[PDB]
Amino acid sequence: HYVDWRMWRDVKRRKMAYEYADERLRINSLRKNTILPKILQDVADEEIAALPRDSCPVRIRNRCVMTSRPRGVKRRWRLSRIVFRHLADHGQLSGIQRAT
Amino acid sequence: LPPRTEKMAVDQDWPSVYPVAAPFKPSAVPLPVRMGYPVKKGVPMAKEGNLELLKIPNFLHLTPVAIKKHCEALKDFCTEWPAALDSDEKCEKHFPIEIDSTDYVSSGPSVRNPRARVVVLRVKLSSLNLDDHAKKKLIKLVGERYCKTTDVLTIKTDRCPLRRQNYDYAVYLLTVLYHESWNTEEWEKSK
Amino acid sequence: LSEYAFRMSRLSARLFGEVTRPTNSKSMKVVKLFSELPLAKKKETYDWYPNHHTYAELMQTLRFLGLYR
Amino acid sequence: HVFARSPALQVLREMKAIGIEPSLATYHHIIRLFDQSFIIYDIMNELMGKRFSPKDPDDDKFFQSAMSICSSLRDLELAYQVHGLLKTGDNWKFIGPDQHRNFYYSKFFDLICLMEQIDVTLKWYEDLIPSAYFPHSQTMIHLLQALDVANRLEVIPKIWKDSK
Amino acid sequence: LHVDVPKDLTKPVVTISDEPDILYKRLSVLVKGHDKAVLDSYEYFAVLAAKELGISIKVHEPPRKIERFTLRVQYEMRTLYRCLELEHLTGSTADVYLEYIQRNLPEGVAMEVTKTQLEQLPEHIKEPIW
Amino acid sequence: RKNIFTGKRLNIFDMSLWDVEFAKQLATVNEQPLQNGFEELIQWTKEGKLWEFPINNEAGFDDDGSEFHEHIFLEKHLESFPKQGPIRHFMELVTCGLSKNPYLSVKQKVEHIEWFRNYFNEK
Amino acid sequence: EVVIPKKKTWDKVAVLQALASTVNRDTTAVPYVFQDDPYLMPASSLESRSFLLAKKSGENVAKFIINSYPKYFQKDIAEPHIPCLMPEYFEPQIKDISEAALKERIELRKVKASVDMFDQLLQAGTTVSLETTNSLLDLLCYYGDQEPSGVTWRAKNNAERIFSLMPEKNEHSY
Amino acid sequence: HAPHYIAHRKGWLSLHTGNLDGEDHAAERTVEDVFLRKFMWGTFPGCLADQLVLKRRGNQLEICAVVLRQLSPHKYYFLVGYSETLLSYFYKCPVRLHLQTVPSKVVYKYL
């Protein structure tokens, strides 16, 4: 019952990103040090690659939570400019006023 | 039905009408107060039906009468500042250590704030039993935590999740710093 | 640096719980990786969206029960 | 009924002697047994100033029953004593459900109107109504009769506005 | 109430423990709002309560903060501050006063209470180890 | 003319679901409607619905009753690892990071270290 | 001579109770349970009772919805956790034929299920603990072979059958 | 009054600490506000004479609404009880409604 297919895809990504985060961090930690032998770093490059592609934290987009807009999103409110302006102009966003 | 403000005497006990914080009730507040930007050849809108008066965080539950009555009843919970401590000159003498901790009151379903775990310990090195070498070593160990102008060592702990754990860690840090300032290793002579 | 300064710094780094054994810039990434909670485990990330199933199916149930228009 | 009065008093004396304290339920039972009536004076005299806690399911039925007696005896000082007991501490929590509350207050206010000076009757009228209860039409008739007896006929308009 | 008054009242139980009470040298109360009039009313209330409880209080106004941004249409957020410095009050007075003024905190106003507890040296730091 | 508390007595004496239900019946004896706003706040606080003042930001959270030394000194879990190899330097970095983490519990940090132990063991 | 004072302790609701003791009852208002709006203030005792019953019925409908669909109210956002604002579970979770499921059904006051499972345990040859059968017989005797909402003791009711079947009848049973 | 009078003549319908400098959870409060407004407008159809006012103090949530005297008081009480319970269990906080009836829409002018 999400806004559209694109939002549902991003909700799917954020789920697996949460589940795989600890394992990714640990395997990623092995490859980011100049101590362990190169034999081990080369394999963790294979271990990290084999993990499901949507688990990568770089494939998550900050879509609007009400319109699923891909861009124009203020992260502090998770709302696109069009939805923000609607709420801010009606005085329904506490503390927000038009500047003078 | 008619509003009950018609039944209120002019010498009633107002704190009983608004004991706690409540939104503005025009049928309970017996004031002809008006709020609104008036129209041309107009008057500010009356209280009945006024949303602007309904948007004010009013202080009808805290009037001077009510504040005094509340603060008279709350005296029983207080304890007395020890008279010996007249000013800071004696507070810093009898209690050298100062522990700063902060609490945050927001509005929401959750009370957790991550900034409340930070603890700050402040102690003047002149109030510690340090000789010359001990003081020098302590200063060199602490680094920028020590300020020469004020003679104050400031240890800010935020490692642990809780605040009690950070306070314990700050006390432990002070103890270990003192004891290792009072120790002389072999490499010391290589100064 | 100096023998005295080097030992003093390596002792202060043992009292305060920093990296005692010498290390380089690339290797200090592990410390940052494990000191901070990863982005994918932040409550701004995994709970960025409202449910939209709880919110939408609750309306469905409410209207079917005749308590919402 | 009447065969039970001395045995019940004997049982109360036994319970006191054994070291088991009476509750509001016990006094309620004794009062309702005797009312079918000067034991209420001693019961009150023993209860004055005391604070109670819920020990039996029937405790909440005391005050109602007690008030009933004060109405039948037409003893206003006893009514004030019972009300003062109710006002001591957290005693008010024993007034019971709304039906019992209305019964208690209606009998109480009827007694005030019948026996008290009219100005104190008006003070009780404003303090008790509508904050404590909503009056019954019989209470309005009683209040009007009290005003008639006290010859304060300037007040009927306000009373009728209130009844409306 | 004119006649129907409570005969006796159950005052709360406040037990005097045997443990020592905390001492707070200072207690800084920073209240933030979007509205200056609410902060002024809250200043009046807090100061009056402090005077009535015997606490030593001094008030000042930190400079305001203005976050401007643009979506053109330019929006703004003002944050105004009021600082109440209480001084030389114990742990129990601090608890009761803070509960009172936090329970009476008006909507839209956030609070940050910084508490500077006074403590003695640990016995482990009185003298060096041999 | 004498009180009813003097006179004859029986002279006999001298000095589960059922019980919870009897307690619930006793509760109904003083079950009255709320009388004013303070009573409502008192009841909500007793139920646990309202925050207890003065606000404590760590209310209901005790970190499993752990102490500071269980968060900051995690090098007692590195006993099973190589004691002087590059693995020791790496795990020293890992524990230095984990000791500066206020967002994890001791259990999660030891779980990290145990994952590392197992992984290095397989290799 | 720094004489540090002794700490005073009090219950979490002491301050509210002191403030409440400051304020007295309002003579010109209806009880707090109603709303001060003139259109909604009850004007008669019958009207007051009717309004209270309506409010309670609304609360009951909301409770029915919440318990009927816990999946929409399981998401917890309150710190500290509030147990009284979570859905209640009235359904058995243990489904196998075992004494623990019987104890579960007795805890849930599900009379008919408990009787049926006691019969099924008898059929499965599983010997029941004395305490468990005493708990069952508590439930049956209190509720009189009816589910939760007088009931006249019906001869040969389930309590009597269970009681007669008991291998050992201790004082608690009688 | 137009949007550029929001801090000059009008106020803010919702009041909370989220948008203050240094505070957190602004987005959560905004989403809560949106659901509250939709829910109330669907649970009180044709009753609300004006906008809701959503106030937040500590853990509390006060919906101060202005309604009409068209619906019967019994239905108002039923809906208030239902809404209080449902919103309290949905947000895990003690919600509370503060209906204020007016005879009809409080007209200010004729735009």
Swiss-Prot record, chain A:
Protein name: Small ribosomal subunit protein uS14m
Family classification: Belongs to the universal ribosomal protein uS14 family.
Record disease entry: Combined oxidative phosphorylation deficiency 38: An autosomal recessive disorder due to mitochondrial dysfunction and characterized by perinatal hypertrophic cardiomyopathy, growth retardation, muscle hypotonia, elevated lactate, dysmorphy and intellectual disability.
Gene name of the record: MRPS14
Quaternary data: Component of the mitochondrial small ribosomal subunit (mt-SSU). Mature mammalian 55S mitochondrial ribosomes consist of a small (28S) and a large (39S) subunit. The 28S small subunit contains a 12S ribosomal RNA (12S mt-rRNA) and 30 different proteins. The 39S large subunit contains a 16S rRNA (16S mt-rRNA), a copy of mitochondrial valine transfer RNA (mt-tRNA(Val)), which plays an integral structural role, and 52 different proteins. Interacts with LIAT1.
GO BP term, pick one: mitochondrial translation
Taxonomic classification: Eukaryota, Metazoa, Chordata, Craniata, Vertebrata
One cellular component term from this protein's GO annotations in UniProt: mitochondrial small ribosomal subunit
Range within the parent protein: 28 to 127 of 128
Keywords assigned by UniProt, alphabetized: Disease variant, Mitochondrion, Primary mitochondrial disease, Ribonucleoprotein, Ribosomal protein
GO MF annotation: an example: RNA binding
TM annotation in the entry: none
Swiss-Prot record, chain B:
Subunit structure: Component of the mitochondrial small ribosomal subunit (mt-SSU). Mature mammalian 55S mitochondrial ribosomes consist of a small (28S) and a large (39S) subunit. The 28S small subunit contains a 12S ribosomal RNA (12S mt-rRNA) and 30 different proteins. The 39S large subunit contains a 16S rRNA (16S mt-rRNA), a copy of mitochondrial valine transfer RNA (mt-tRNA(Val)), which plays an integral structural role, and 52 different proteins.
Protein name (record): Small ribosomal subunit protein mS35
Superkingdom of source: Eukaryota
GO BP, sorted A to Z: mitochondrial translation
Keywords tagged on the record: Coiled coil, Mitochondrion, Ribonucleoprotein, Ribosomal protein, Transit peptide
Origin species: Homo sapiens
Similarity-based family: Belongs to the mitochondrion-specific ribosomal protein mS35 family.
Record-level Gene Ontology MF annotations: RNA binding; structural constituent of ribosome
GO cellular component: cytosol; mitochondrial inner membrane; mitochondrial small ribosomal subunit; mitochondrion
Subcellular location: Mitochondrion
Keyword Disulfide bond found: no
Entry keyword annotation includes Coiled coil: yes
From Swiss-Prot, chain F:
Subunit structure comment from the entry: Component of the mitochondrial small ribosomal subunit (mt-SSU). Mature mammalian 55S mitochondrial ribosomes consist of a small (28S) and a large (39S) subunit. The 28S small subunit contains a 12S ribosomal RNA (12S mt-rRNA) and 30 different proteins. The 39S large subunit contains a 16S rRNA (16S mt-rRNA), a copy of mitochondrial valine transfer RNA (mt-tRNA(Val)), which plays an integral structural role, and 52 different proteins.
Stated name of the protein: Small ribosomal subunit protein mS31
Subcellular location: Mitochondrion
Source species taxonomy: Eukaryota, Metazoa, Chordata, Craniata, Vertebrata
Family membership: Belongs to the mitochondrion-specific ribosomal protein mS31 family.
Transmembrane segments: none
Residues annotated as signal peptide: none
Domain of life: Eukaryota
Full-protein positions shown: 247 to 383 of 395
Organism: Homo sapiens (Human)
From Swiss-Prot, chain G:
Keyword Ion transport: no
GO BP term, pick one: mitochondrial translation
Domain of life of the native organism: Eukaryota
Pathological association: Combined oxidative phosphorylation deficiency 51: An autosomal recessive, mitochondrial disorder characterized by intrauterine growth retardation, low birth weight, poor overall growth, progressive limb rigidity, delayed psychomotor development, hearing loss, and optic atrophy. Brain imaging shows abnormal bilateral signs at the basal ganglia and brainstem. Patient cells show decreased mitochondrial complex I and IV levels and activities, and generalized mitochondrial translation defects.
UniProt entry keywords in alphabetical sequence: Acetylation, Mitochondrion, Primary mitochondrial disease, Repeat, Ribonucleoprotein, Ribosomal protein, RNA-binding, rRNA-binding, Transit peptide, Translation regulation
N6-acetyllysine modifications at: 71
Organ and tissue specificity: Abundant in testes, skeletal muscle and heart tissue.
Parent-protein residues present: 56 to 259 of 689
Name used for this protein in its record: Small ribosomal subunit protein mS39
Biological function: Mitochondrial RNA-binding protein that has a role in mitochondrial translation.
PPR repeats: 94-128
Locations listed in the record: Mitochondrion
Entry keyword Transit peptide: yes
Listed GO CC annotations: cytosol; mitochondrial inner membrane; mitochondrial matrix; mitochondrial small ribosomal subunit; mitochondrion; nucleoplasm; plasma membrane
Species assigned in the record: Homo sapiens (Human)
Family indicated by similarity: Belongs to the mitochondrion-specific ribosomal protein mS39 family.
GO-annotated molecular function: ribosomal small subunit binding; RNA binding; rRNA binding
Lineage, opening ranks: Eukaryota, Metazoa, Chordata, Craniata, Vertebrata
